Every structure is written in C-alpha cells, then in structure tokens.
C-alpha cells in the first residue's frame, strides 16, 4: 500500500445534522453488517448535501444514506444509488433499505469484480493521491 485515506465507500451515509450521529452511526453500521463499507459525512453548518452527493459519486459511493431530523422520527432514509440506472428510493425503512442494499450491493458486486485485474495491466499511480 501507501497510506490509505479510506477509498470509495460502498454506502456512504449522509448526516447533515449533528443530532443523528449515533441514529446516523447505526444505519451507516447496519450496512456494514451485511460486509458493505460504510462511512458519516458530517456537515455541521458546512457546505450541503450535493456538496457531499457530488463527493459521493465521483468518490466512487454507488449507494448514498440521507440522515435528518426528520428522517431520525420515522427512521427512516434516502438512499440514492449512483451507478447504474437512476434509481431514487424515497421514503424506505431500514429493513428495508437493508435489503435494497443487501440485494444490490449482491448484485453490483457481480458487476464490481467483473474479473481477476481487469484488461489493463498497467497503473502507473492511478487516482486519489494527494
């Protein structure tokens, strides 16, 4: 390796709020749970979500969490997927997106590897380096 900063995040959850952080924490966990790289993207009073939507899916981020106050009541969040067709879930329930999550991500995966290296045998320092 080198350093490791944290690489692209298989579910990145999405916690403008501070309040969620430990609501935030769980959802983020839960998709760990199922083996899926999850991170918090905390924005107390910075920037705004696109800012990080934007970082979500140049970051790599397929599967983007919505955390809010609201979203802390009926726990419930929004999660947008960025590869593949535009697929927008509103409104989802944590089993649920658990499973929307646990199913793609089976599925993306499969998509992901697509094989052993792909055809490019060369790298020559490849992206995110600082």
């Known amino acids: 390796g080198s350093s490791g900063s ?25 998709v760990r749970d199922l083996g899926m790289v999850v991170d918090l993207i905390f924005l107390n009073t910075e920037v705004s979500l696109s800012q990080a939507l934007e970082d979500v899916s140049r970051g790599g981020s397929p599967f983007a969490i919505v955390i809010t106050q609201q979203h802390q009541i009926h726990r419930s ?4 997927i960025m590869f593949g067709t535009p697929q927008e879930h509103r409104n989802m329930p944590q089993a649920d997106a658990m499973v929307l999550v646990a199913r793609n991500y089976e599925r993306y995966k499969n998509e992901c590897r697509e094989k ?6 060369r790298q020559a320092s490849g992206p995110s380096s600082g």
């Open 116 to 121: 052993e290296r792909e055809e490019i045998a």
């Open 77 to 80: 969040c929004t999660v947008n």
């Open 6 to 30: 944290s690489g692209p995040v298989d579910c990145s959850v999405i916690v403008v709020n501070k309040q969620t952080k430990d609501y935030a924490e769980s959802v983020g966990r839960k």
